[PDB]
Scaffold this active site. Structure first.
Site, PDB file in Angstrom:
ATOM      1  N   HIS A   1      -3.617  -3.256   7.966  1.00  0.00           N
ATOM      2  CA  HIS A   1      -4.476  -3.670   6.847  1.00  0.00           C
ATOM      3  C   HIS A   1      -5.096  -2.394   6.276  1.00  0.00           C
ATOM      4  CE1 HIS A   1      -4.486  -7.996   7.335  1.00  0.00           C
ATOM      5  NE2 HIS A   1      -4.752  -7.856   8.621  1.00  0.00           N
TER       6      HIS A   1
ATOM      7  N   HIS B   1       0.790  -1.224   0.000  1.00  0.00           N
ATOM      8  CA  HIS B   1       0.000   0.000   0.000  1.00  0.00           C
ATOM      9  C   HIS B   1       0.820   1.271   0.000  1.00  0.00           C
ATOM     10  CE1 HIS B   1      -3.657  -2.367   0.242  1.00  0.00           C
ATOM     11  NE2 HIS B   1      -3.068  -3.055   1.206  1.00  0.00           N
TER      12      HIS B   1
END
Length: 104
Positions: free
Chosen positions: A97, A10
């Site tokens: 996450h 990410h």
């Protein structure tokens, strides 16, 4: 699952992610979507400062986001750039996450 993998999955050093390349690696394995955050790691990690037990948190600030979204052609992607807040799972003071853009 941990901060190191959250960063791999990410965090991007370019807004202009080469979707059709990176999305086809084993880490992403041609999945339909992935969001990348164009940022140094520290502003991202700071989102979770002081948070121990796993909790989803919506960023206070907006970030530069680069989404790879599959087209009608398998494993071929449109890059969609946006400015928004995002929701992460914070755990022991780091993002583990990516939950979603805009809202938890």
């Amino acid at each position: 699952q941990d901060w190191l993998t959250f960063q791999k999955k990410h965090i991007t050093n370019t807004r202009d992610v080469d979707c059709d390349n990176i999305m086809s690696t084993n880490l992403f394995h041609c999945k339909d979507k992935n969001t990348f955050i164009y940022s140094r790691p520290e502003p991202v990690k700071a989102i979770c400062k002081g948070i121990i037990a796993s909790k989803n948190v919506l960023t206070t600030s907006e970030f530069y986001l680069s989404d790879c979204n599959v087209t009608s052609r398998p494993c071929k992607y449109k890059l969609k750039k946006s400015t928004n807040k995002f929701c992460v799972t914070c755990e022991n003071q780091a993002p583990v996450h990516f939950v979603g853009v805009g809202s938890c």
